[PDB]
Amino acid sequence: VPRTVLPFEAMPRRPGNRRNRLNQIRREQGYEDLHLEVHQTFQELGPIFRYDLGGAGMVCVMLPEDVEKLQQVDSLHPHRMSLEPWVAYRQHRGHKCGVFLLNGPEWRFNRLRLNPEVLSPNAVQRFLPMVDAVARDFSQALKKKVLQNARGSLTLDVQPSIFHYTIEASNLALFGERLGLVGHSPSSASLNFLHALEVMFKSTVQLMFMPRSNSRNTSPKVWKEHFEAWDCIFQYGDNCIQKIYQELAFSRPQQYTSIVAELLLNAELSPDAIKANSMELTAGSVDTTVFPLLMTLFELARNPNVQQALRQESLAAAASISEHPQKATTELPLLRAALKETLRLYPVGLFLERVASSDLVLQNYHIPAGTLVRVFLYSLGRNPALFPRPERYNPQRWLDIRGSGRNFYHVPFGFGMRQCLGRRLAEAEMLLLLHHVLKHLQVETLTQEDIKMVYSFILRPSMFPLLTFRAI
Ligand code: HEM
Ligand SMILES: C[C@H](CCC(=O)O)[C@H]1CC[C@H]2[C@@H]3[C@H](O)C[C@@H]4C[C@H](O)CC[C@]4(C)[C@H]3C[C@H](O)[C@]12C
Ligand SMILES: C[C@H](CCC(=O)O)[C@H]1CC[C@H]2[C@@H]3[C@H](O)C[C@@H]4C[C@H](O)CC[C@]4(C)[C@H]3C[C@H](O)[C@]12C
Ligand SMILES: CC(C)(C(=O)c1cccnc1)c1cccnc1
């Protein structure tokens, strides 16, 4: 690094030895306010600091310029601190690890053979009609509940139905199957699969935060629950892959039907590798897309001028998107901007993480090779220097957006070759559900109070309010 950069020792340090009630806050609520605690530290120390704990020091950053510098020192296979409970399940049952868990050349081999079928513009053009079909079914089911309510309006908890929508849409894109989670009586097999997804994620978070001194005897029931949930998920995956094998051998269609069928036809990855990646993509919808979809509905309820501008756009584009759902990618610029605005205020992952593959420089400080660097998305999005009136929900800011490093202003899906593999499937699900709902319905909430987010592996709303829908 240049001789003019400040030494690592000069970086502002978060005091580890202050007298305050953090000790007691940890006893009572653990790390549930970590986003706010780190945000306060950036306010005090500036946009880079060393978080000292247990003899170690994580570098905390929050600027687009830092994300750009990290993308520069990404290797051909950026290192990931693999989710241990998920790895342990694969080790125990003799399943492969997929891109969520792999490192090194094996990660890259897998990733390059998935990108064209999941992340590419061509992949999106193929799956958009399937996501559109599920979005229509969800939107029609809600409109029907509204129009049959005695009170001319429907106040409901939308959290379960929006979650079910994301699983239904993703599972259709991946395996070409409808679980039926829009019906009032979905099959026991579909509900068992959904339950297993929920238990898998809940048990992941319980195991990651299991104290060392309690693992021997508190963890075995949780490990059992985790592995039994994964067994159910892998049974569903095997069932779908066997069905696809049968279709491709004896009844092969000319047209695209599913991401997994395309991977099996390509035959670049082994069947066991395709299953592992399909199960990780399956898991990728659990407790992710639901949150920005909910928070977009919440902010549209609070910002009726923005809601009406999005409704005008969706009504003007409605005919074009009905003819070719693929048009949703270019004909709803303000709604795409609204998704960026939701994720600016309400990231799902709290941070992006890299281990410095080489010495580098961030904010004119020398960063030694091997340093843990975390980009805190909550703080990046609330920087008033880059996002004037950062508390304001203003999708127009993205159509206006200026500044040198503007490519790195929107990074809630990460960056570079190890960015979120599911990002375009997540984006399409959010875009099309909101498009179809806004054409038919208006949303409100009783109070305009900010939602409290809690950090529990992901950032999630504490007490998401009932929403009220009415016909337009
Ligand atoms: C709004 C919803 C979501 C957000 C904000 C999100 C965000 C992220 C982020 C930040 C990463 C790490 C990227 C990096 O370090 O550069 C990631 C990885 C990943 N995400 Fe997502 N994600 C979401 C939804 C999904 C969905 C729906 C799927 C699957 C259908 C998915 C599949 C994955 C996979 C497989 C990886 C690992 C990629 C790899 O390591 O090669 N994600 N996501
Ligand atoms: C290391 C810890 C406690 C060890 C002890 O003090 O006895 C034990 C408790 C539960 C154990 C895990 C559970 O038995 C579930 C898994 C069982 C597999 O046979 C090994 C990995 C596996 C993931 C185990 C790893 C490790 O041995 C754990 C985590
Ligand atoms: C930063 C914080 C410690 C802060 C403090 O004691 O002041 C630590 C303690 C436990 C850590 C978490 C746990 O190790 C569980 C998770 C492990 C994953 O690899 C990253 C996220 C993950 C959710 C961790 C994030 C973060 O490093 C946590 C929350
Ligand atoms: C939200 C979460 C946990 C995420 O931000 C993440 C996942 C892997 C690595 N880094 C961040 C995630 C989880 C599943 C799919 N995509 C994203």
Author numbering: 31 to 502
Describing publication, verbatim:
The crystal structure of the CYP11B1 mutant complexed with metyrapone was determined at a resolution of 1.4 ​Å. The other nitrogen atom in 1-pyridinyl seems to interact with a water molecule which forms hydrogen bonds to a propionate of the heme and the main chain amide nitrogen of E383. Second, the replacements at the two residues (L244N and W247N) in helix G′ of the wild type caused uncoiling in part and a shift of it. Along with the structural shifts, the substrate access channel has an open entrance. Therefore, the replacement of the amino acid residues caused a complete lack of the activity of 11β,18-dihydroxylase without marked effect on the two monohydroxylase activities.
As their physiological functions, CYP11B1 converts 11-deoxycortisol (DOF) and 11-deoxycorticosterone (DOC) to cortisol and corticosterone, respectively, while CYP11B2 catalyzes, in addition to 11β-hydroxylation of DOC, 18-hydroxylation and 18-oxidation to yield aldosterone. Thus, the key feature differentiating between the two enzymes is the capability to process the successive 18-hydroxylation following 11β-hydroxylation.
